[PDB]
Design a protein around this nucleic acid. Structure first.
Ligand SMILES: [K+]
Ligand SMILES: [K+]
Ligand SMILES: [K+]
Ligand SMILES: [K+]
Ligand SMILES: [K+]
Ligand SMILES: [K+]
Ligand SMILES: [K+]
Ligand SMILES: [K+]
Ligand SMILES: [K+]
Ligand SMILES: [K+]
Ligand SMILES: [K+]
Ligand SMILES: [K+]
Ligand SMILES: [K+]
Ligand SMILES: [K+]
Ligand SMILES: [K+]
Ligand SMILES: [K+]
Ligand SMILES: [K+]
Ligand SMILES: [K+]
Ligand SMILES: [K+]
Ligand SMILES: [K+]
Ligand SMILES: [K+]
Ligand SMILES: [K+]
Ligand SMILES: [K+]
Ligand SMILES: [K+]
Ligand SMILES: [K+]
Ligand SMILES: [K+]
Ligand SMILES: [K+]
Ligand SMILES: [K+]
Ligand SMILES: [K+]
Ligand SMILES: [K+]
Ligand SMILES: [K+]
Ligand SMILES: [K+]
Ligand SMILES: [K+]
Ligand SMILES: [K+]
Ligand SMILES: [K+]
Ligand SMILES: [K+]
Ligand SMILES: [K+]
Ligand SMILES: [K+]
Ligand SMILES: [Mg+2]
Ligand SMILES: [Mg+2]
Ligand SMILES: [Mg+2]
Ligand SMILES: [Mg+2]
Ligand SMILES: [Mg+2]
Ligand SMILES: [Mg+2]
Ligand SMILES: [Mg+2]
Ligand SMILES: [Mg+2]
Ligand SMILES: [Mg+2]
Ligand SMILES: [Mg+2]
Ligand SMILES: [Mg+2]
Ligand SMILES: [Mg+2]
Ligand SMILES: [Mg+2]
Ligand SMILES: [Mg+2]
Ligand SMILES: [Mg+2]
Ligand SMILES: [Mg+2]
Ligand SMILES: [Mg+2]
Ligand SMILES: [Mg+2]
Ligand SMILES: [Mg+2]
Ligand SMILES: [Mg+2]
Ligand SMILES: [Mg+2]
Ligand SMILES: [Mg+2]
Ligand SMILES: [Mg+2]
Ligand SMILES: [Mg+2]
Ligand SMILES: [Mg+2]
Ligand SMILES: [Mg+2]
Ligand SMILES: [Mg+2]
Ligand SMILES: [Mg+2]
Ligand SMILES: [Mg+2]
Ligand SMILES: [Mg+2]
Ligand SMILES: [Mg+2]
Ligand SMILES: [Mg+2]
Ligand SMILES: [Mg+2]
Ligand SMILES: [Mg+2]
Ligand SMILES: [Mg+2]
Ligand SMILES: [Mg+2]
Ligand SMILES: [Mg+2]
Ligand SMILES: [Mg+2]
Ligand SMILES: [Mg+2]
Ligand SMILES: [Mg+2]
Ligand SMILES: [Mg+2]
Ligand SMILES: [Mg+2]
Ligand SMILES: [Mg+2]
Ligand SMILES: [Mg+2]
Ligand SMILES: [Mg+2]
Ligand SMILES: [Mg+2]
Lengths: 91, 44, 274
RNA sequence: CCCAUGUCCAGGUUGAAGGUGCGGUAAAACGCACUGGAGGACCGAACCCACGUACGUUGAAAAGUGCGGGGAUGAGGUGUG
RNA sequence: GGUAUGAGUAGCGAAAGACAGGUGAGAAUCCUGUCCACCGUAUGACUAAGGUUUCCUGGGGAAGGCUCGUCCGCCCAGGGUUAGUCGGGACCUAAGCCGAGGCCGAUAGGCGUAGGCGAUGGACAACAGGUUGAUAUUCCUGUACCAGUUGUUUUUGUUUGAGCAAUGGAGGGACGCAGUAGGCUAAGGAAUGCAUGCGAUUGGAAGUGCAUGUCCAAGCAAUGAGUCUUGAGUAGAGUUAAAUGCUUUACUCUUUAAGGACAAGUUGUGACGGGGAGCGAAAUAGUAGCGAAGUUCCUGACGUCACACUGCCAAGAAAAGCUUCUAGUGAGAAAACAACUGCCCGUACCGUAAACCGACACAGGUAGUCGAGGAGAGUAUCCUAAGGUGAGCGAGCGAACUCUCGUUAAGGAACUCGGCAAAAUGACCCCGUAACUUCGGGAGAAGGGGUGCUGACUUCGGUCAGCCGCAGUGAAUAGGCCCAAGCGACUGUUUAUCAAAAACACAGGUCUCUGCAAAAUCGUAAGAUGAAGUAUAGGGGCUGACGCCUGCCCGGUGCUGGA
RNA sequence: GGUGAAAUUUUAGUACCUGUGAAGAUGCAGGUUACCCGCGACAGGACGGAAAGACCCCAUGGAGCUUUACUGUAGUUUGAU
């Protein structure tokens, strides 16, 4: 897959916003991307230097509307920690 | 009082899973029957 | 020797066991050990084919040199060892060239004896020779039925056989059962009788000990139901109530011979017994 | 029922064989102490079982609970595959 | 399918709550507080499975909740699971499974070799604290370790070649049960050891008073209770080819040692750090923040050294990792330091359960770990600690009857099919203990005595003396006994869910088959079990410990032999 | 006060005695007794509820079992080829 397709979007939440204060950035990533790919994708997309990437899988969540019930899509969340002496991401 | 169903993820797949069904000719007959009937879930 | 346990318990009452005096070590030769799983009488279909087998203690197989075809060098007896897989004891022998083997321990074998095999070996206990080289009247064991195949007959504790004569390419042998037959003269045998003669005198003593030795209980046919056994059914205790007692599969159990009536070996069996 | 591989059995009790010493003897058998720690051994929780009885009997439960009961290092219990 | 009747009846599922204040349209039922009560070898703390969002936060009160509801494991809306080191994969094999060719077979297929798959086992590198509403050995802080990469410096090797190194030779990994000694350390207890805070009105106490707390990794360095082990050399044979490795045969010397291999733990450093009784802020909580002491003595682990030792018979995985050896491969290697690289999956939450299996927020069932104190042998028992809980209908009344429980005059089995049920016995110490016996037993037979408190005195178990009560294992929890007969020797096993027995099994006995491609059994067969066993073995029938015994009949029927 | 089933049920304004009757009637006959509606209790009756009697017999029903029932047959064995 292309590097520009690995990173889907940022994650903006109370937890991710807090983590930005520590210079780590949460993204939704392609479910098939390993944390090394994410590191490479982040660096090429933002010119930053990445110190560490932590990565989790998010299970699909049960939801219902009216008479219909199903599941939200599975997601893959990558927390990218930038090095010191490095540019930050500005989303 | 121990009841008959003692759930076990692995044993469910090993006994009833898709690959167990596919590995025998009569297992494939089951999958053919489930598909013919139109079951949303053909294997366990 | 056989030691008799005092009746400290009803289970211990009347029980006896060997004192294992002849056993010189309990450290088996690692190189010669192989794994055996307990089949518990079940075959490759997973069915019980032989009843009353299963459970009991775990065992490691000791590879026994039944062929005794290493003739170049002599082997010095190092130990007499317990073997869970057979009624006889086994002897660890070191060949002068460093090859290690187990043999069945003959009666009178002693640590330090130097054993030889081959046509020119002396007629001494523990030596293995082709039957053609063994004088008539000699007590032998571990008789191979086919040249190079390895000893098959006369291997259990205390057993022995005797050379009776030579006719043609065959040696006349009296087996332990009393049968007299011809064995191909190129077949080898070991001189002596098998040791641990006292094995037969052991009073097992309690049901649990038989379970240790991998024997599951026998149920008599008479106390089964008719769909389980020809002896099953009837009200109260019953007699056999048939022409003759039979096995679970209807085969007569008293006196009926089961040897194939067209056996090839019949030509080689001179006088039967058992 | 079996196979492979794990695992569990609070705490007490009794004191088999063997060994040692001193007696005994030609040597012994053998006697007495001590030591030794055997057992489908003993008492008893967990654990397993299910003997009596009451109760329950549109139940708390499609077989249980209460009070007692048996086994509890074994032919033992039990997990995983 | 709808709706009646029974009925406004049965039931509302094993238990403690009370009141104040609050919230709100509304509260026995939600929140807060206080006291009270319940579990505590647990009703606590973990974790595997299983579940699969039930976790957190903010709202909600239709339905679900056996009542209620402002509340909820429910509904709505948002959010939450972070690892080179944990568990799994990129490592290993067991049972078993699959199975190239192959063997077998109306078809279908069955079996099976090489080769694999497959843990419940083997192997394998980090820890303590902090942090969030919800994750943390995963984030952060500190300090590590394992594999590898690039570069710098330092040494030494360039084919009389260091080094690397087999899929090959080896070694190793590597294993049972029981029994106690011993060492260490959790842990526990005590103290007029230390630290901090207090002097308490209900009569008394400023001291021998009260309450509380009383120490910390991995790594690294050094040591270490101890544990196991003889160590050489000469000459030979071997190790499909080689070897300096390894196996081994002889022979010399050694062996209370020697050398070697292991080792719980300890001390120091990690740590000027972190925790820590308690004190305790603002701009509105007990939260920032700050922060004392860390001693002695007693007990002391089947937790660990360690299956180390001893004994036993029933005799107790494999493979890889690993370590060696050459064969081969080699031009470069290694050390130090610096910088840097390290993937996938799981990681929320419940988990003796209202979130698992039981149709239920069901008195059942659910592997493993930790599981404190007093008295105690104890994880029993009673009450408690840390911690958790008051259990999803209530308020009255205090009838019959039913259930569960307590006490009963005199009698004491008269009850009844039957002492069913209940009562009584019950712990520890001491005295004592029959027939019979297979000499072990029977026995805890039986039958008796003692048990509290306070001084004196002790050979440390008592003794003497005194004292109080109806009663001293003052509560709780720990045999009723004896005589005799039948049956079964015994411990065991069985009709899950009306039978636990005299039934089955059993050790022992006997008969018989079976000479090994054994008999026997599964299978059309191949292929298996029997057995990697071999007549002291294996199959089958019957009997059923042990003791004494087991008589007569072979005409019949079977079997065996004859022919 | 709250919540709220069930088995059963042809419609029921559903007494007693003696009698009658498919021979044991709340319901028929004759006589006797009895104001209307409940509540707490007890079980004699409603041949009470539950289960299309299991005993018994029957059906040219079924199934399991036995054998010197009949007819076959796997297996075993003997001969020919
Ligand atoms: K479906
Ligand atoms: K016995
Ligand atoms: K043996
Ligand atoms: K039997
Ligand atoms: K019978
Ligand atoms: K009961
Ligand atoms: K109804
Ligand atoms: K009604
Ligand atoms: K709410
Ligand atoms: K991992
Ligand atoms: K494992
Ligand atoms: K090397
Ligand atoms: K470590
Ligand atoms: K340290
Ligand atoms: K987690
Ligand atoms: K104590
Ligand atoms: K306790
Ligand atoms: K409530
Ligand atoms: K009342
Ligand atoms: K009553
Ligand atoms: K009476
Ligand atoms: K007695
Ligand atoms: K007294
Ligand atoms: K007792
Ligand atoms: K019996
Ligand atoms: K018996
Ligand atoms: K008898
Ligand atoms: K019983
Ligand atoms: K039985
Ligand atoms: K007998
Ligand atoms: K027999
Ligand atoms: K018989
Ligand atoms: K027998
Ligand atoms: K006869
Ligand atoms: K006859
Ligand atoms: K009628
Ligand atoms: K009635
Ligand atoms: K039937
Ligand atoms: Mg992860
Ligand atoms: Mg048998
Ligand atoms: Mg029977
Ligand atoms: Mg039959
Ligand atoms: Mg019969
Ligand atoms: Mg009879
Ligand atoms: Mg016992
Ligand atoms: Mg007991
Ligand atoms: Mg259990
Ligand atoms: Mg049972
Ligand atoms: Mg008993
Ligand atoms: Mg009523
Ligand atoms: Mg309740
Ligand atoms: Mg309590
Ligand atoms: Mg308890
Ligand atoms: Mg919640
Ligand atoms: Mg909420
Ligand atoms: Mg409600
Ligand atoms: Mg692992
Ligand atoms: Mg196969
Ligand atoms: Mg093929
Ligand atoms: Mg293989
Ligand atoms: Mg590890
Ligand atoms: Mg949490
Ligand atoms: Mg005062
Ligand atoms: Mg060679
Ligand atoms: Mg210890
Ligand atoms: Mg968690
Ligand atoms: Mg429950
Ligand atoms: Mg009385
Ligand atoms: Mg009285
Ligand atoms: Mg009477
Ligand atoms: Mg009477
Ligand atoms: Mg009674
Ligand atoms: Mg008491
Ligand atoms: Mg019995
Ligand atoms: Mg019993
Ligand atoms: Mg039953
Ligand atoms: Mg019963
Ligand atoms: Mg019998
Ligand atoms: Mg009439
Ligand atoms: Mg009438
Ligand atoms: Mg009328
Ligand atoms: Mg009329
Ligand atoms: Mg009726
Ligand atoms: Mg009928």
């Amino acid at each position: 897959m292309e590097l520009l397709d690995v990173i889907k979007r940022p994650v903006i939440t109370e937890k991710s916003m807090l983590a930005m204060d520590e210079k780590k950035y949460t993204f939704e990533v392609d479910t098939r991307a390993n944390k090394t790919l994410v590191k490479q994708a982040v660096e090429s997309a933002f010119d930053v230097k990445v110190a560490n990437v932590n990565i989790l899988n998010v299970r699909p969540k049960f939801k219902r509307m009216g008479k219909y019930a199903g599941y939200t899509k599975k997601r893959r969340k990558a927390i990218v920690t930038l090095t010191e002496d490095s540019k930050e991401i500005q989303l | 009082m121990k009841r008959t169903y003692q759930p076990n993820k692995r044993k469910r797949q090993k006994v009833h899973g898709f690959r167990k069904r596919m590995s025998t000719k009569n297992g494939r007959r089951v999958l053919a029957s489930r598909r013919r009937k139109g079951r949303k879930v053909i294997s366990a | 020797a056989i030691k008799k346990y005092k009746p400290t318990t009803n289970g211990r009452r009347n029980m006896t066991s060997s004192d294992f005096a002849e056993i010189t070590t309990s450290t088996p030769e690692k190189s010669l050990l192989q794994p055996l799983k307990n089949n518990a009488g079940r075959n490759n279909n997973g069915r019980i084919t032989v009843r009353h087998q299963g459970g009991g203690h775990k065992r490691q197989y000791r590879v026994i040199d039944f062929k005794r075809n290493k003739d170049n060098v002599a082997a010095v007896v190092k130990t007499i060892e317990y073997d869970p897989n057979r009624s006889a004891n086994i002897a660890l022998v070191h060949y002068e060239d460093g090859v290690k083997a187990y043999i069945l321990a003959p009666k009178g074998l002693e640590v330090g004896m130097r054993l030889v095999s081959g046509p020119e070996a002396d007629i001494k206990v523990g030596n293995a020779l082709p039957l053609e080289n063994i004088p008539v009247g000699t007590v032998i064991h571990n008789i191979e039925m086919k040249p190079g195949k390895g000893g098959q007959l006369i291997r259990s504790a205390g057993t022995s056989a005797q050379v009776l004569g030579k006719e043609g390419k065959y040696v006349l042998i009296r087996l332990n059962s009393g049968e007299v037959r011809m064995i191909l003269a190129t077949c080898r045998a070991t001189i002596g009788s098998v040791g641990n003669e006292q094995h037969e005198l052991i009073n097992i003593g309690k049901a649990g000990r038989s379970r240790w030795m991998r024997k599951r209980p026998t149920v008599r046919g008479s106390v089964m139901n008719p769909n389980d056994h020809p002896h099953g059914g009837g009200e109260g205790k019953t007699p056999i109530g048939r022409k003759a007692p039979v096995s679970p599969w209807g085969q007569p159990a008293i006196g009926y011979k089961t040897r194939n009536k067209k056996a090839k070996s019949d030509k080689l069996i001179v006088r039967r017994r058992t």
